[model samples]
Every structure is written in C-alpha cells, then in structure tokens.
Target chain A: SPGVVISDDEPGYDLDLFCIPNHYAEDLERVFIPHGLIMDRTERLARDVMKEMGGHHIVALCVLKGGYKFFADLLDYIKALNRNSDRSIPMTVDFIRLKIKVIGGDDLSTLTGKNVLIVEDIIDTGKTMQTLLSLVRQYNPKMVKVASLLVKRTYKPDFVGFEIPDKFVVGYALDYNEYFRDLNHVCVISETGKAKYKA
Target chain B: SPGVVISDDEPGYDLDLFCIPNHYAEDLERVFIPHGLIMDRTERLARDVMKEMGGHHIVALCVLKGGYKFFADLLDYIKALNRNSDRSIPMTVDFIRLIKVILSTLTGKNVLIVEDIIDTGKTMQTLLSLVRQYNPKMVKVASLLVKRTPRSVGYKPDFVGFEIPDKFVVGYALDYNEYFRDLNHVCVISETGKAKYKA
Candidate 1:
C-alpha cells in the first residue's frame, strides 16, 4: 500500500473503527448523519450563527487541502444566510495551506486580527487544531470559534479544539484519496477508502 | 530589522542571482550556493513543469510542497500542453507529498513527475511519462538534469532537470525560508524558510 494506509491492526488504524459506526462524530452526539449532511447542518448552523452575530463582517479562512469540502459548504450556507438575514453578517473568504513540515504542518498564525473562523472537515489527534487555536489567539480576533464537520470519538474529545456535532461531509471537494472529490457525491469513509486513500 | 531583507547593504543578501541564460540549471554547476539560495533555487530553478500524455490522463505529480510554486507552474503548463499535444494529455494531477510516499504512489502509475532538481539519485525518485503507443500510464518530467537529453519520446527528456556541472544543491530548495516561496518570484538566501502557510 502506498501512502499511509492504517489497517485494522495498524498503529492508528484499528478494530475500533468498526464500533465507531458510520459518521461516528454525530452518532455519538445523538445525531444520525449521511454524506450530504454538512449542507443542511451548515445551513442551520449559519442561521443560528448569523442571528447571534447580528451584522458583522466575517471571513471564512479555509485551511485548504483538508478543509476544501467544509469551506465550500460553509461558504454556501453562510451566503444563503446572508440573503435571508437582510444582507447582514457579511462574509469573506481566504485560504492558508499549512504543512507541519514535521508531523504534517498544522499551525495557523496567518489569520490574526481578523474575524476569522477556523473551518475544517474533521479533527483527529487534536495537535493540529491546538496549534491552530494557539496561533489564532495571538491575532486576538473578536472571537475564535472552531467548527468542524466531524470528530473522532477516540481522539479524546476533551482536548479537541473544534468539534461539530453531526455530519458526514462529502461532495465536490471531499475525497477518500482524491477519488470521490471529483465524483460529485458524499460518502462515509469505509474500509475500502481506508485502504485506498490513507492520505 | 526583523526578518533579513535582501537589501543592498547585507553582504549575504548582496549575493548576485545568476540566471541560467538559455540553460536552466547553470548555477548548480558553477559554485557553492548558501543554504538560502539552495532552497530558493530548488523551487525557482524547477519553474513548474507539466507534461501531457495522450487520452484523458494528464497525470501531474509535483516533487513536493518544497517546490510548490514551480510545481504549480508545471501543472498549469502541462494542462496547456495537453490541449496542444497531438495526443492530448488530459490532465489528472496529484502530489507525491512525501519523499517516502513515492514508494507506494509511483508504482505502475502513469504521470508527469515534476521535480525541483535531481541529484546523486539518493532520494529514490522515479517518475513516468505517458506513452501514447503503450500501456504505460504516467510520465516523469524534471526541471533540471545533469546529463545530455534523451532521444526517444517514450523515454525522452520531455522536461528539464538541472543544467549545472553538479556542485551541490543546497538552498535552491535544500535550504531557504519557506515564506520566500510566496514571493511569487525567486530569491537566493542563506537561511531556510521560517514562516510557512497553514492549510
């Protein structure tokens, strides 16, 4: 297997994946999610979020490569919210590709002093998210909130920075090893995917 | 004052930037390049090269994010090449990501491999170019080479490698500030990149 494919017995890949259920992040939160769940959740999240922000300009700084799917949906939902909210809570978009250069780049210090939201599809070990949160804090934005599409229950949620309840984000930008990204459909990560697109 | 700017006074910054003239890899042959220049040149010299294989397969594999800018250019160029080639190399691109990732990613894979520079052949790099006449899938295209160009199309030198007499490549990519990459142009430096993008 090329890349890093974690099999059932591999260090990171294990049998627990089976018990985790499909879209485990949401199921643990008492929510059932399908592939396209992000769109609906994003819409609702935006509605409630926009209502809270009143009318403020916000920029969705997407962490590319991983967050491409989440960023697209979040932007779409936020745009829809803007239309319904009388054009309030204006939104902007920016991108920053972070490569840990070591364990895989995850620090995010680029979005300082901006009303930015750290958007991601999911979080695992929490190291990357923590690095991002710490970096974002120095900029001292009005507020820094993390909104992720999924979270790994096994990842010790207590330490995670951004945790979204339910959603198996899949679609134009999502891919299990660059396959489904161009497929125009969302899907739950499977053994086939785990073996195929280990990233 | 803060980051070392390549101003006129800085002796190291005062270092001259020599172009390859018609040849792309001249500096590599001439003399010792400081750490900064090595990293800078690795990317600057590669200068984004892409290849077009016939059919719907325009496989582009960048050397890595180390040569990010050059690879992006190579991808763009290859996409253009596909449209013009009599065989039309439809583009399907990807990145090797890690030097180690190649062991698994490059097998029986048909792609146009773009690298910053190839030297010593120690890193174990293998890339392929799509041959319209065969069952082969991808092609390897380097920005620089140390030897004479090959003749046959199936195994010909479609892209450049290095143009130098083979001194040692250091900062052309081996060393240099990561932030310099975003400068959109190349610069020779003694220090490797300290700031990088977070995606």
Candidate 2:
C-alpha cells in the first residue's frame, strides 16, 4: 500500500492523546486518525504526487466540502517540495461537486492537455470516482488522477491519504449531515452518536 | 493595534533560523512569519474571535483562494479553543461560493467572514456587504494578516491576526503563480524568484 492502511480490528489512537469539543464527547467511538497524522500523511502523499507529476502546471480539482482541507494542505506540501528539491510543479486549482455523481467541474476546457489531480475526502463504492475519472477523460487532459484522504479496498486512487476498513467516520471534513463537519479529528462515529446526528 | 505590526526596522525571522530548502535559499529575502508562529498567532486570533463573538450561533465564511488554509487552521483553533473553553459557541462554515443560497439558508444566524489577509480592507468590506444581503443577525470579519497597499488603509477587520508591512510575501496559502501556497511559513519572495517563476 502506498499509503498506510489502519485495520479496523486494531486499536487506533486514543482520545487522551488529543482534544475533542465537550458537546461531541458522546458522539465518537475512538480516534481513527488524529489531526497531526492526517497532515503528516498528506505531506508524504504530496511528494508522491510530485514524483511523477512535477515540472508541469498541474490543474488540481478539489471535491467540495469534505475535500477542502485535504486539497489545500496537499497542494501546499507539493509547493514546498518543489522549492526544496528545486523542482517546478506549477499548479492551479478549481472546484467540483459529484452531481452521487454530481461530478460538477464548472469548466473542463482548461483541463485539456493538462495534468489534473482530483482531490477528494473519502471513497467506498468507487462509482462516483469512476464516473469522475470518465468525465475528466472526456476533456482530453494529458493525464488525470484522483487523490483521496481515505478509502476502502474497493477502489484505488492514484494517490491516497489512508486506507481503512468499513465504518462510518466523521470529522476532518467527513461528516454526518452537518454535525461533524466542524470537528477537527477524524474518528469512528458512535451508533448513538449517529442517531443524534441523523437527518 | 488589533494585530501586531513588525516594523521594517525590526527584522523578520532569519532564514537560517528555520529550514528553507537549499533551492529556495537564494529565492527568499527573509522569513516574515515562521510556520509555527503563524499558527501560534492564529490560535490567539481564534481566542480573540471567541471572546467577542461567542455564545451565539455563527456561520464562518472562508474567502477562497487565499483564505483556504488560514480559514481551515483558524477554525481548528476555534474548535480547539471552544472545546477547551467548554464549547459555548456554535459555528459552521461556508466558502465564498453559490454562497447566495448558502448564506440565505442561514439567514437568521450570525455570519463570521474569515479571510487570510487584507490590505485596504475593501475586499473584506465588499464580502461583508454580501453577507448582509441574507439578513443575518450579526456580521463580522476575521483575518489572519493585515497590510497597507500603496493607496493604503481602510476600516480594519473585526479581528486581525498580524499587521504586516506590505511587501511581496509567499507561503501559508499566499501564492505567486499558484506556486508558493505550499510554503509552510511566510517569507519575502526574492526578485529573482519573481522573474524565474513569473510564467
């Protein structure tokens, strides 16, 4: 696995290691991944993206809401890598919303003949991602790739932040409706917690 | 002063003080705000934001492109401060987008417009104007950094992080040709780098 995959059976990080808001105390099972670790992993994923995609003006597409934090952080690391290694991986960004396949990229013309990286939050079914890949392909870009923050074995993104087993997680942009979106850490949501946040 | 100003007479952080890749060594004049310190100041800004704006439901509108990283980091600090403070305030986020309905969706709530930096404060003010169109109960602007352009000055934001001298700066989500947003710290871009990456 290019990115570390944490097994569901194994114990993950503890709550005492970090902090959570009082209101959400009862809403989580345990920390699946802490904030700092998410950031650290992304720095590595960025280098991975640059290893092949560097020296070109890459057009990065951020899948909305969930992908916001990861997209910004990943690209930031990529630029740092460029400066550190004295490489030039010029980049630009745009936004898209999967229309369950929302697949909303406002304009695809700019993507033509350009290297494109799709930054997303999580993937499970892989249907949305496959459709996204297909849609971008229609634009005739020189290349297209997806970088996700989390995933299951069902699919493989060109670049990934983490691979984990089945479980409803929240925070770090992953959410239950609107509840955990404000959360700082990514963790397993409690069953009762899920009931409380249900739409 | 709401935010501290680093006078030109008082030199910014030295380059060697922190790590800058050998490649970017000649491309940076000095580090204006190291990554850790920028984050430190942001936490304080979060505290300041909470002290004034807490106890009410609020919507944080992140100004896009430049404000992306600062907005994310500031909110994490806000969420942290809220957690540490017992979670008194209620908040959510919306980026600068379609946005019309998004803001209208929360018409009765307080709106906190988050920004990375402001020069004359005109753009921030304009954003504030748009937020009011939705008839929110309260509206305020929070920015991580402030500066004065050649034309100079405007009404300051409700919350300011650092009042910096106006100069060419990169890193911490600020960019030149979309290249430097990945830089972890704030630094003055050298004239040579400008010409080199000008494309």
Candidate 3:
C-alpha cells in the first residue's frame, strides 16, 4: 500500500545542479535521487510510520549496508514527529545485514511480542523481503512491517520511499564495491567509473 | 585534545523562535542547544574524525541508550567526508549496549567509540579497556557533549563536539524520565518539566 509518496517514473537530476563533491564529480553520471529529496521523503515516511506504529514502542531494525543512512535520517525525523504529536512514541534500534545470507546480528528471538519495522534501502525482485518477513515470523513478533527506500516491483512495502525503474544507484549510502556509499546523493555511476572501481 | 569545537560557556536559544513543539513548549526552560547547531557541529566533528581516523578502515562502535542519534548522524557525515576525499575511506559499524557484540568486530581494527555525552567519563574508560582487551589496532572517542563534572576516571574523548558546564540538559537523544529524548534540539529542563516528568 502506498502510505507516502510513490515515484512512478524515473528522471535523472543533473550532477551540476546539486552539490556534487569534487572527488565524486567525475565518477557520477547523474543524480537519480538527490539527497534533499530523499531526506524530504524520509520525513514523510516517518510521518506515515507514526500514523500506523504510534502509541506503541516499535523496534526499528535497520537492514544494513545501504540502509544505514536512510535508517538513521528516517529515525531522527520520526523522533521529531513523535515529539510534536500529542503523545510521544518511543522506539528502539537494532541492525542486521543480509548479503548471501543474513549474518552477524541479534537473532530474532528478542523480537517476540514486539512491533517491528524493518528499514531497508532497496528491494529487488521482492524475494529478500519475503525471506525477512518469514524469518521475523519465526520469532512471533506481535506485528511486523517493512520500509524500503526503493523498489523495482509493483508490489509495495508498508512504507515505500520511491518506485524506481531498474537502474544501478550509488550514494546516500548505496555503494558500488563499498566505495560510493560516502556520496551524499543517490546517483547513477558512469560506465567509466563503474569499471574503474569494479572488483 | 580539542580537534574540533569545544563549548566553553552556556547559552540557551529562544524556544519560540526555534521549532519547539506545542507539547514541549511549556515544559522546556529554554533551548540549551538548538538542533541546527548540534547537527552543524556534528558535521565538523565528522571532519575531525576523518582527519585523524581516515585511510584505515575504521569501526564505529556506538554506545547505545543516549548515543543513538549522535552515532547515526556522525556516521552519515563521515560517509560524505570520505566520498569527498581523494581516496574513499572505508568504515564499519557496531553497537555496544552495556557492552557486547561482538567486540570481535573491533579486533585489530581502528575503532571510534561514539557517545552522546561524557560526564564522569567512567563508562568511557570501561569501553576503552574493553576495546583494548580485544586488541584493536587503535581506539578513539567522539562524544557530542562533555560536561564539566568531577572526572572520577579523569578522561576526555579525542573528538569533543561541545564542552559545557554541568547542567540538566535533554534532547538530541538526551532524556529526562525518557520524555525528551525525541526532542529535536538539546534543551534545559525547566523546573516545571523536571518535577512534572519525575520518576
């Protein structure tokens, strides 16, 4: 369900328009999603999260690697929203990383009887989310929902940041070989730079 | 050593001028540290972190409870700093509750221990010893606020964001009866709010 803004189409923002740092200036093609817009949408997502998940303490499980930046910024906005509300909603933080397999984190046992919000950067094919949901269920969490920044499929997460077409993005913590995670804006990498840094 | 800014005096921002929420307006004494100033200083601290801790792949160990917001914001700025650098510095993240986990992640790695504030610095000392026991290659601290309290441990963080006198402050993840942790800015707790929210 589309709780917040859904980007139905893809448009590239020019690199020159925004503050493209010098080192990254030559390495990027165009900004797919500028940092400013991402942050604005994150503020919206936090509102949507509060509308559903408010009045109860929820666990914000950051799906790591790409999710860290978005997760961090989103949580801050949520805190602000809660403060402004008639009642303040409390939240806790946890993290897990899913690569070839979900590795090195708190096992889901702590999630039992807790409302969980799984925050992720992007979902491709939607299979990984299913696996995460299935795994979270193993522990019998009271309720579970997902918030993802980008998705390729038509199906949506509980909170969808943007529905983007198939395009490689690096920045705002999305990385290419772990190099571009530092870029403030989510951008498409140039073929030359992609090949230049490829493992 | 003061690599970045260290707050020497105390001043409070006008709440009516800042985005003080309706619920908290009557509760707060004054905005001790505005959210804008906290974030702006965080950016500077991140640069200080990069100057000394760059090049080597660093492990940012977040000391939980009060440290989450500062920890999250600091890492994002570091990522941006690395991106703007000639060589993108790499980093990893881990969290320590009262202290756990996996210090194995910190083994032989340059570690930056992130904290919300350091009053007595005793716990910071405990963390240093713990990280040392793990035999990390290096260890340093980046605390957002430092109070002029009796240092039982006689310790100071390497990267100090703002140094202020001992006072009852909350927000930017600081809490009073856990009520004000969600506040966007760091603020002084009013006698009314203090006794109002007492445990």
Candidate 4:
C-alpha cells in the first residue's frame, strides 16, 4: 500500500494504483497526438529510409531509454520492408547511453566498416547527436545516418554538416522538455505543467 | 594543438600519441592484481563452480564490456574441464549486454551468468529475472570481484575470485573513463592519475 498510489474516490481499492508523474496532471493540457498515427508514420519513415539506402547490411545504433520502444517499432517495419525489397537489408541493433559525465557505447566493434543507422527518440538541441557522431567516427564506419521519431525546432547543429536525418515522423514547435517523454503519443505540456513538474 | 596533451620533451612525438594511463609512461601505481593471476583464478573458479554443480552441462552468459575477456578465458577452461570430468559436462557460450536484451535459448538448461565484477548486484538481479523467463533448469552467477559493500539488490554470485575494497579498478578489459581496459594487469587508479585522465 505504501508503494501504491490509490485514490479512495476512484472505485474499490482492488482497482489498484500507479503514478508516473508528480503534481502536474491537473495543470497539463494535451494536444492529443494519437498513438496509432505515430505508429503508422514510423512505419512509413522506416520504409522510406530503407528505400533511400537501396540496400546494405545496417547496424542500427539505438540511443537508450526513450529510443527503446521507437527502436522496436522501427525495427519491425524495417524488417518487413527488407522482405519486400530486391536486396536484403540484414539489420543488427546496438544500444548506447550518454550519462551525465560518462558516455557508454554498448558495442562499437560491430559498427566497423558497416552502414550505421542511429535510432533516436527525439532530437532537441542536437548536442548529443553531434557528440555521438564523433564517437562513432572513431570506429571507421562505412557511413552514418540518423533516424529519429521526433525533431524539435530548437535542434540546430553548429558542427560540421553530417548525414542529415533520413526519417522522422513528427516535429515539435514548442519546448515541452521531459514532461511528455513517457506519453505513448507525443504531446506538448503547457507552461503551467512544465513549472509544476520542473524538478 | 589545443586539445593535445602531448609533451615535446617526451621523445619527438614518434612515441605514439596514445595515453592509456597505467599502460604508457605515466605516473600510475603498481599492479594490485595481475592479469595472469586473474586468468588462472578464473579457470580454476570455472572448473570449481562446474564441479560443484555436479558436472551439469551449462550455457554461460557473458556480461559485456567488462566480462568479454574474462568470459572467453573461463569458457576455454570450462570446456577443458568438461573433457576431463567423469560426467563430461558440455558447455555453450553466449554474450549478453545490459542494454540490448537479446537472449539465446535457455529453456531446460543449466545457465551460468558471468560478470567481471559485482558492484551492487542490481545487474545480477535484473539478469536473473531475464534469464528466468526463458525457463532455465537452473541459474548461477560467477564474478571476478565482489566489492566490499552491501549489495543494493538481494543477489549473490555463486563463484567469486576476490573480495575487493570499494575502489575503481582498471585492466583486463576493465576501463576507467574508457581507458586502461587493454592493460594486462588490474590496478587501482591513483588520485593523481585519476585527476589527470578523469572524464
């Protein structure tokens, strides 16, 4: 009962309880991006990117935490597209996480001389994007490209031009930060919502 | 030249631009744990653990990054031990990373999870759950070092090489800030050395 966040007014205690957010639900306003639409767009993006490449074995580098669900969905679509394509695109996926001071690359050896596709949940300021690119460059990959679920307007890279993202399903014009990260479908959190949960 | 940490007095730069702290001519301390000693201990431990299990066939899971070199050596000894055993314990090897959760078949097999060091036991707990879902007949863990601190998770390694004080150790594929992993000896990083190359 201590770990459970049950509401007495909402049905029986048997209804169970869980809380993902803190003190900001009532203050939040939703733009209402449908999950199905996001899935469909992701599938389309996967197909488009694969077709654009024509065909090669791809090592998909998944940026961790947020990229997991998106990576799985994208991988499924990419495999489906592979079956229909003239040339087979055998795909292998690796995961990487950038901690506050530590940058951990899951497996860099697999990227050597292979076409690399970086799968990310969102591209905000493109700083992580830039840093990761340089990290991968040390491995001497054949080529590197990006595939993301969403891109915000603030994502302006100051570094030398790299392979621009080949596929992205959505773009956010507003800065919602971490408020809507756990949402199945993308949505913008209002200013009040942001301030309420600004931990 | 701004990012360069090289010295002109250090032999005209033909001395190679590599800086692996303990490996090169740097102010690092002596080896607290030698690689050959670790290798021997690992082989002995592998045989001992397998013998303790009554010569059952095992599928060894190698926890990546830190575990690769250790796992490879252990697998060799385990295989050799299998041949010498009266029961002739057969063995198979698999690599598992913390981030990418691709599992090999584990149903009705004796699974031995190998790790370089057991810091907090949380990783061991997570891996146990992951492997349990595959319906392994039995599961056990083997680690090189167990830190002298209370485990965060309620799990313990079935086999261990050494109990070390809670200090950052580097060598034999164990890195500090992604350096010193290639060193043939395990060493405690000095305060000066840590300050010089700390990320």
Best by DockQ: 3
Clashes of each: 55, 5, 1, 0
Candidates' interface RMSDs, in order?
16.5, 3.4, 3.3, 21.3
TM-score ranking from best to worst? 2, 3, 4, 1
lDDT-better candidate, 2 vs 4: 2
lDDT of 4 by residue, B11-36 (tens): 22221232233233342454556666
| Model 2 agreement with the true structure over B1-199: per-residue lDDT tens digits | 4786777675677898888766666778889988898888888888887777775676787766533678878887876666655443445776654323221566887778877776355655566687677788788887787776657466688888887777888877787776665567889999988987786
Per-residue C-alpha lDDT of model 2 across residues A73-170, encoded as one tens digit per residue: 78678766777555644567666565635333246877888888988887666777788788889989998888888886535888878888777788
lDDT of 3 by residue, A24-132 (tens): 7778888887888889988989998888887777777877653367877888788777776775544566666666355433466767887889888876657777877
Best by TM-score: 2
Question: lDDT for every model?
Answer: 0.41, 0.74, 0.74, 0.54
Q: For candidate 4, what is the TM-score?
A: 0.45
Write down the lDDT that model 2 would get: 0.74
DockQ of each: 0.02, 0.32, 0.36, 0.02
Which segments of model 2 are wrong by more than 4 Å?
A1-22, A34-43, A76-80, A93-108, A124-127, A152-155, A181-185, B8-18, B85-90, B97-103, B119-122
For model 2, state the Cα shift of residue B116 in Å. Answer: 1.7
The runs of at least 3 residues in candidate 1 whose Cα sits more than 4 Å from the true structure, single-residue gaps closed, are A1-32, A84-90, A100-113, A155-174, A182-199, B1-199
Candidate 2 or 4, higher TM-score? 2
